[PDB]
Each structure stands twice: as structure tokens, then as C-alpha cells.
Amino acid sequence: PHELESQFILRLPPEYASTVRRAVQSGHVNLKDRLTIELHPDGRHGIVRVDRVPLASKLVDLPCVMESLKTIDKKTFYKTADICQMLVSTEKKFIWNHGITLPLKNVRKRRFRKTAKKDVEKEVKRLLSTDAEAVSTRWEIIAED
Template sequence: MSNKNAAKRRETPADAVNDLEQQFILRLPPGPAMALRHDVQTGSLTLKDKLSIEMQPDMRHARVRYGGEIFSAKLVDLPCIIDSLKTVDKKTFYKTADINKMLICTTEDDLSQEESDSPKKKDKEQKKFIYNHGITPPLKNVKKRRFRKTLKKKFMDQPEIEKEVKRLFRYDAEAIDVKWEIIRDEAEASTSGQIMEGSTSSRKIPPGLLQNEQETSMDVASYFGEVSSSEDEDKDINIMDSGEDEASRGPSTPRISYGSLDRTASESQDIPETDTGFQQYKLSELSSQLTQIRQKRHRKRLESMEANIEKEKLQDDYEDQFSQADSEKFDI
């Protein structure tokens, strides 16, 4: 029994491929189009006998017969996709398919005249079947007026390139010793490998300089410290008073000494001569910052001295007035 069932299953496979519904627009000349529309709306039972479509092997040309007339048809590609909807109550619509092709029916004379007018387009099969218009009069030449041109791909000699790459890999596998080198683009190297000095002269930086620059560049925060709160932003650094009492300094007040600057100077001497321009630029920048800090500190000192003098003067005036008041009491 099992063998018979198996034989029956083989005869009727369950994985039968069913073609999906495909739709296209059929455009007939004005007279036959009105007659066909009337037959469709009235539900004529003889429509199957009246209308027949026979496609050619290239699936681009066809012969359409309606009634006693025979038309030559051409299947063209529409500029865009059109949704096909169905309804029963004219309120709810259901999408059934995407339409992107139209079968245009013409007479024999029109088709032969069209082919004779454009003999050069026979080589370009794709452009022959691209329709530049829409399905309504306002969309005439819509593909040229509203659609952007398609970018053309520039095909390279990909097979030859792959063949050359495989050959190089094969040589590398067979070689005893392999050496490789990274070559940078000249434009990129010129932009990232040159710096302009004060004398408007450019020099090339060696490849290892970018790494040495990060290692040997002087950090300003390491010398001037970091402010721990917003209240210390108004405070200034006193470089000259390095021997003052440490108790007078706050815990967040940065300290700096000339020994650190001497140490950086000695380290800068160990750097190769190729980095001297960069180090000189950094040193000049630091020296300008030190000068600004000293000037600011000097101004603060003057302001504090003036405030102290005014305070002493007010205190002397108050003591004089107090002494005069005491003397007047004793006289009374």
C-alpha cells in the first residue's frame, strides 16, 4: 500500500508552481477601444471569442485580434510603476498588482513606418521599448521633463585586474622573502607633511615626526596646572614667589619652578634638529603666556597695595577722630 501511495504522490507533486497574476495596459485605437470598453462594462459573453493576444518569442511584439480587425502591438516599459486596485462597493479598494508595461496596438502601416523612420535604433534594444510618456495627456514626455537621467556605469577591466591580483598573490606565496612598502599619495603627503614657519619657509616632516610630536610636545597644563573650581579662575600664578610660605597657598593653587623649565630645555636639546622649528614655536608660545601671567600678577599686586594703603589711611583717620573725641571729653 505504501508503494502505491508513493507512486501516486510522484504522479501528482504537491510543489506545483503557480504563476502569479500579472497585469498590463492594453491600448487600442479610438474606435476599437470604445467598443471593447462597452463589452467589458456590459459583461459580454462573447468577449473571449472576440479578443485574442498572440505574443512573439521575443516577448516584445504581439498580434492582437479584436472582432474582425488584427493589430500589430508592441510591449513597452512605462516610466514608473502604477498600482492596480479593485473594488466592489466603490468604498474599499484592494491592491492587486503593480503595472509597469503597456501593450500599444497599431495598424500594420503605422508599425512599418515607425521601424523605417528609426533604423539607427535597432542596435539599441533597450531604448526601443522605453516609453517616454505617461498614460494621460498631461504626462506627455514626462520621462524627459520630470525624471532624472540614469547614471551610466563605467565598467573597468575587472577580469584583467583580478587576474593580475591573483598572479601577485601566487608570486608572494612562492617567494622566500617578501618586502612591502606603503606609498602615500603626493598630494596628501604635501598637505599633512609640511608646516610653515615664521620666515614663510616650508619643510617636510619625516614620517616619525607625527608620533614624536605627540610624545615631545609640551603640555601647558603640566606646567600651569588645572583649576579645580570656578572660584580659582580669578586667581593668578605667581612664578617669582617660589620661596613663599606653603601655608599661604591653597591646595588647588598650582606651583611652578624654573627647574622644570630647565628640564624641558634640556629635553628639547635631545630632540633631533628636524624638530627644532616646532620646539621653538612651542617655547615662544609658552614664553608669551608667561609674560602675560607676570603682567597680570603685577597689576593684581598694585591693586592690592593700593587697597591696603586706602585701608590704612581710613584706619588712621578713624583713630584720629576717636582720639579727638576723647580729648574733648576730658576737657569738659
């Protein structure tokens, strides 16, 4: 079978980004030994090791949706993957408010319509489970107390 490739964006500190960029544009397999990216079983934490120097990483959710588009003639572009995550290196904390481009900054706060979001259904399912495992349930919409 075929499994859709999973592309994400890696953000590095600027000096380490310059060393990684120089090693990528060089093209040797020396870069393969130098740059590493550990992923922890939290799923939202990691180490990226540049030249064997550990950096602390967080995998965050991006507010917009990006799409990688490949081309052979620079006139027709074929969509290859959807990017929604970034492993910035240096829950609410794992959500990034800004977008990658310069015009998109504070997009989630300002350029996004506040569609109501409810996560919340899981808590309701847990409440239903505590209900079904009980015997007698008493409920009242309340006031200030």
C-alpha cells in the first residue's frame, strides 16, 4: 500500500539555523551525523541535536494550513502533503498563534473568525460513564452558590 508522507516544519535558533542551512546546501552525508531530532513519548516534546549540541523542542500546531506543491515545469503544481505542525527549537502551550509568513502574525487572535469550538465532548463522555456506573442521579440547574 501507499502511506501519505508526513511533512512538518523545523524552526531552529538563528545561528544553528545558519549552520544547518550551510550543511544542507553543501550536500554531503556529514550533515546526517551532525543534525539529529529526538522525539519524546509525550508527542509534543523533543531534542534536536545540531553538531551534537542538544536543543529543546516543542511540536506545535499551526493556525493556518500549508500545502507543499511540487512542480516540474513551474507552471503546473501538484499538491504533495498538508503541513500543520512545527518543531520549534530553542494543550494551549502546543498551539502556535502566529503564521509562518510575515503578513500572518497574530492570525488566530485577529484574522480568524471566532467559530465556536467544543476536547469538550470527551469530558461529557466521562460524565456519562460516571452516570452509567452509578445507581441514583440527581440534577438541578443552579444559581449563585
